[PDB]
Amino acid sequence: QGDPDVLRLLNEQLTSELTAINQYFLHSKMQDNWGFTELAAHTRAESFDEMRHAEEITDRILLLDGLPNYQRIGSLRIGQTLREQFEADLAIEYDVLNRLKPGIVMCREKQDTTSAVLLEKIVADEEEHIDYLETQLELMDKLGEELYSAQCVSRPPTSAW
Amino acid sequence: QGDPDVLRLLNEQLTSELTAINQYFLHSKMQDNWGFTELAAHTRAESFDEMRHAEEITDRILLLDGLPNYQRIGSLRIGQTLREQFEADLAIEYDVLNRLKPGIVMCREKQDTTSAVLLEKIVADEEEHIDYLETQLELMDKLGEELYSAQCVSRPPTSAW
Amino acid sequence: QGDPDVLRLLNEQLTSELTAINQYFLHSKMQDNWGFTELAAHTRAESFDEMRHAEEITDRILLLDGLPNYQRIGSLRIGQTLREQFEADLAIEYDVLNRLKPGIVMCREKQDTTSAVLLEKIVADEEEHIDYLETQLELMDKLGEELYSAQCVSRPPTSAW
Amino acid sequence: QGDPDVLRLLNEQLTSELTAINQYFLHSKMQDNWGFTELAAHTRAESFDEMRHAEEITDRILLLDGLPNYQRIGSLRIGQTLREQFEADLAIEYDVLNRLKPGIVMCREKQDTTSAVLLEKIVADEEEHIDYLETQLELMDKLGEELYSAQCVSRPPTSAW
Amino acid sequence: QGDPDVLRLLNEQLTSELTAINQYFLHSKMQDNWGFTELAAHTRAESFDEMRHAEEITDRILLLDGLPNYQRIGSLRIGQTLREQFEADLAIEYDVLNRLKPGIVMCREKQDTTSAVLLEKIVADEEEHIDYLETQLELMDKLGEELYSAQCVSRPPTSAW
Amino acid sequence: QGDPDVLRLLNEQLTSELTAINQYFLHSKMQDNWGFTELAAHTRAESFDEMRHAEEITDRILLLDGLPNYQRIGSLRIGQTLREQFEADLAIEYDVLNRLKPGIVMCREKQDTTSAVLLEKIVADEEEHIDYLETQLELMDKLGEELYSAQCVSRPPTSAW
Amino acid sequence: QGDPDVLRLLNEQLTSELTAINQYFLHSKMQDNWGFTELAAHTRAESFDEMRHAEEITDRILLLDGLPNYQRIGSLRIGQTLREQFEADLAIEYDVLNRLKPGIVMCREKQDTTSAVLLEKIVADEEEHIDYLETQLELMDKLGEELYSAQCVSRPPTSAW
Ligand SMILES: [Fe+3]
Ligand SMILES: [Fe+3]
Ligand SMILES: [Fe+3]
Ligand SMILES: [Fe+3]
Ligand SMILES: [Fe+3]
Ligand SMILES: [Fe+3]
Ligand SMILES: [Fe+3]
Ligand SMILES: [Fe+3]
Ligand SMILES: [Fe+3]
Ligand SMILES: [Fe+3]
Ligand SMILES: [Fe+3]
Ligand SMILES: [Fe+3]
Ligand SMILES: [Fe+3]
Ligand SMILES: [Fe+3]
């Protein structure tokens, strides 16, 4: 099993997943720590969702006789404000699309449809998340940073613990 | 209404399904009768899964105004030891892959995506079964035949009746 | 070990069952596909019943140290109308009675009563089905083909989907 | 009154049942006492099966106005190893088939079908036990004695008490 | 079509059933009327038991393209005391055995096992009812008629109302 | 290892149990067959009671490294009337007392209290069964045999079927 | 007040129990610690059983105005392998039988039956355990040490934590 070009694509996406997991998780802990507890819970969920992706890819790789790469993490764009965090996470998302769109076509050319369908679902998921992040940035401009941030705390406001 | 080439492909796969069902079911009966009753349940489930594929393909053929071929069987490979059975069953699965991979691409070129999607699912499924069979053969080597077989009996060993 | 003439008879019946299963299942899919969904469900159950028979004969053969023949199918007679299907299915059934009636007598001469009882039960089942099939034909003449067929669709008429 | 020859056959089979009951029960206790507790439970069950057979024969005999023989026990052959026990038990099962096969034919010649059916059912039951026993012997050769034996103990191994 | 000789035998037995049904039912009404209400309930059930037999035979006859005879009835022998009733009912039962024993052998000679099995089951049933009747007569002699009769009443004694 | 004298005594008692089991069970089938269905259920239970005794002794013998004797059976005395049956069963019981009383004292002399306690419990049980049997015989004389027998039937009387 | 020789015997047994409790509990912790967690659980229950015995003897002593000796322990024999542990635990057990058997006889001579019955029950318990221990050693020889040990671990193997 396992076409070297497909395996390499899968492993590169896996590296991207482990990056997203760490980045998203930390951001959610920071949001929590700042008092934005309502938002933190949401961001945390996205993190576990990438975990699910990572596992799905790991499985595909193992089935294909490859060795999953758990050694390499990508760069970490840690935001110091809500807006920076949204933008940072958006940036990871666009890169996934840039890589997976052409990747899918190749998988099908290489006659590996199972890998292709896997990546098609991930694209579908990522498009939704990208939309969510872009909508939040639009909301910040429409409402104002303070007003938007107030919708991110509880009543009364709390902290990480 | 359905493309003649797509229909010949579906009928080829259908024939392959009927062959697999008989082979898998008989193997399950033999394993059962040999005393390997735990394993036999697993193989039995596999033949019922193939029946489900046979029905799905039949549906597709009929919808395309084709005639499902229920007259033709391929050559059964009956193993006379556990290892032979895993290897015989493995042989059918690869043929399935070798056939359906070019077939899916063809179906999409003919713009029949519903038939392509049906075969995409079947391929996904067979890959999981191949991995299962290939793994059983690996375990026989790692554990040794006798030790592996002891894991396929109940406590205490039964008989099948 | 089982007597060779008994095993041959058992295997001949097994070939008959596999044929019947295919014929009946295909007929039920066709009936379903024509819109006769109420009838289709009934014919489906008949093919699963022949499955039950196939497994029982397989067990008996295996117990007698025989090798169950799953490689050979008989000739399918596929009907292109309801009446034809009833007549085609009836042809298999009379065929079984013709084979089994002398067969039982012989099984008992060879002092294999357990095989005899198995075949006695199958004969009893087939007589009931033959009666069913003959009654449907009788009803088609009495009601008329149209009126009869109307009793085989749901309200409102539906399809395989 | 019953035919004296049928009555003599029934009493003869009754003696065989009483023998098998003793032999099977003792073996089960010995297996229990050796540490083979999972196997013991199975052999104990077979012992109560023969008890039911013994009762049914007693009934038939009484109905036929004869005297059931509870005075005579056959020759017990008691195994000192598992393999010996399977062989000893199999030996007695073969005698049954040898006595009952011609016996049934004659019952029917004597026009006593109720007695014949009772014996037909017994033959059916013993063929399944013969198969179970022969399969165990076959498993001992395939797995080895120790490995097979270990499938007959509990985890952890225990004792009769 | 059934064999004409088998059909004749079946209709003879049916005539016997209808006779037994009327006789047993009337005897039970008379026993009830005399005050023997406990016994009457038992005899009534025997009467419905023959009804079931009558229906089974009717069914078989119709499946064989025969015409069930519901016009001919046998001669009732109606007892005027408990003992006479038992002796009268026993007389029908023996006639059933005298006719069915040879009948079964013939049915099997004609290739009709289903009719034979039906009759085998009836012989088994009547054998049990004969035993019951014979046992009651033995009890009357052991207990004396007065003492036996007292076991057939309720506490306190009642009537058909 | 148990003391050889204790082992001999245990096997003697076991032989007695097996004799009692057969005799009591047959007597109960005969009582049932005669119509004495209420009494039969009682005798049947006594028979299973001795089975429990037989198993306890077997267990003790095996724990002491002995070989249980399941080959030797005593002489059955089978009664042809109720009174004979009670007298026949009572005769076994007295023999048990005659053997076990001295037996217990010896067991304690040999340092084997567990075997002694087992036998003490059996003596207690048989003493109660002797009382039951002796009481039934006294009742036959007080009531008369006919009147006593009437207490052993159901209302209304039935049979073994 | 209790007899001085009885009290001494009771206290000697109490010292035996405290020793056994320690030895068995430590063995179970060691077995648990080696990975034989299934076996460990069984050995633990045995030490709690000896606790039960220790308390009963304490009660009896106190009732007889004695002073229970909780200051003295016997010599622990700690095994460094499974087989050694079984043999070490067996050594204590034969020791108890040797002490208790003559002891009981004496208790009864001193006319202290309640103390005698207490010791009779302990002897009965120990015989069962001795059988258990002897059977495990017997099974180690039959299966082999490795195969036997494998039956003492969970799936998958685990540890004391
Ligand atoms: Fe992603
Ligand atoms: Fe995402
Ligand atoms: Fe498939
Ligand atoms: Fe599959
Ligand atoms: Fe059939
Ligand atoms: Fe059918
Ligand atoms: Fe038997
Ligand atoms: Fe058996
Ligand atoms: Fe009848
Ligand atoms: Fe009747
Ligand atoms: Fe007893
Ligand atoms: Fe008793
Ligand atoms: Fe103790
Ligand atoms: Fe203990």
Residue numbers in the entry:
A (entry chain E), B (entry chain C), C (entry chain D), D (entry chain B), E (entry chain A), F (entry chain A), ...: 2 to 162
How is this structure described in the published paper?
Safe iron storage, detoxification and appropriate delivery of iron for biosynthetic functions in a cell are carried out by a superfamily of proteins known as ferritins that are widely found in all domains of life. A subfamily of ferritin superfamily found in eubacteria, called bacterioferritins (Bfrs), differ from ferritins in having additional noncovalently bound haem groups. The Mtb genome reveals the presence of two putative iron-storage proteins, namely, BfrA (Rv1876)–a bacterioferritin and BfrB (Rv3841)–a ferritin like protein. The structure of Mtb SeMet-BfrA exhibits the highly conserved architecture of ferritin superfamily where the complete biological molecule is assembled into an almost spherical shell by the symmetrical association of 24 equivalent monomers that are related by operation of 4-, 3- and 2-fold symmetry axes.
We have determined the crystal structure of selenomethionyl analog of bacterioferritin A (SeMet-BfrA) from M. tuberculosis and carried out in-depth analysis to identify sub regions of structure unique to Mycobacterium species. The crystal structure of Mtb SeMet-BfrA has been determined by Molecular Replacement (MR) using the structure of the recently published M. smegmatis BfrA as template and refined to a final Rwork value of 19% and an Rfree value of 23% at 2.5 Å resolution. Moreover, the circumference of the horse-shoe shaped electron density ring appearing at the documented haem position in the SeMet-BfrA structure was larger than expected for the haem porphyrin ring and appeared broken between two five-membered pyrroles strongly suggesting the presence of a metal-free and degraded porphyrin derivative. Moreover, since the mass spectrometry analysis of Mtb native and SeMet-BfrA crystals was unable to provide a clear evidence about the presence of biliverdin as the haem degradation product, this ligand has been designated as ‘unknown ligand’ (UNL) in the deposited PDB. A close examination of the di-iron site in our crystal structure reveals that this structure is compatible with the reduced form of bacterioferritin. A pore, termed the B-site, is large enough to accommodate an iron atom and is lined mostly with negatively charged residues Asn34, Asp66, Asp132, Glu135, Thr136 and Glu139 and hence maybe the most likely route for iron entry/exit to/from the Bfr cavity.
